[PDB]
């Protein structure tokens, strides 16, 4: 229950943070880029993103600001900080190897 | 630095549970297999592993038993408890590569 949940959370955070590695972005831009990159297989809800963005801004990983702002509406953009990137450096490098590890294990068993 | 920590925990749990999906195994064997498959970059301590396996046996994901040495096993329910998380893990790498393209 909790273990699988943590895995799904980490994968989502991983993805979201890679989007922000590509550039400052807003919730709808992010949701769209993830839907395209997963071919419709991962369409995130706004509320998921806000809870995630809340935690991540609380852990210093992310920042927010208003980027489009007029009398008819505004849009909040989220940005990966330099400190966030360094916090995540080790976690990203390890992620990049997880797939090798799995394939190797599958090889080295069978 | 909490979010990186959860990510790394999830990665460790994912690899260990994939090892046991490959077959029942024992702690020393597991540690050596992961060291080889990680080209030496993930050398798990036995104490670390035992903590993880205690949490996982208390969840019904994992079972343990003695053979003829202690072995750990993915439970029949464990496989299912993990199925969706595994499928999702399997897709993450294509998603990231696609993001990089665009």
Automatic annotation (TrEMBL), chain B:
Pfam families: PadR (PF03551)
Keyword Metal-binding found: yes
Protein name: Transcriptional regulator, PadR-like family
GO molecular function: metal ion binding
Domain Transcription regulator PadR N-terminal: 16-83
Residues annotated to bind Cu(2+) 2: 14, 93
Binding, Cu(2+) 1: 14
Domain of life: Bacteria
Gene3D superfamilies with a match to the protein in the record: Winged helix-like DNA-binding domain superfamily/Winged helix DNA-binding domain (1.10.10.10)
Record's keyword annotation contains Metal-binding: yes
Keywords, sorted A to Z: Metal-binding
């Amino acid at each position: 229950a909790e273990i699988p949940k943590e895995m799904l959370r980490a994968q989502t955070n991983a993805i979201l943070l890679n989007v922000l590695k590509q550039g400052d972005n807003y919730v709808y831009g992010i949701i769209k880029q993830v839907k395209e990159a997963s071919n419709g297989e991962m369409e995130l809800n706004e509320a998921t993103l806000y809870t995630i963005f809340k935690r991540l801004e609380k852990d210093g990983i992310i920042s927010s600001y208003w980027g489009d702002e007029s009398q008819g509406g505004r849009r909040k953009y989220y940005r990966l900080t330099e400190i966030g990137h360094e916090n995540m450096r080790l976690a990203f490098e390890s992620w990049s190897r997880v797939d090798k590890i799995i394939e190797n294990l599958e090889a080295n068993k069978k």
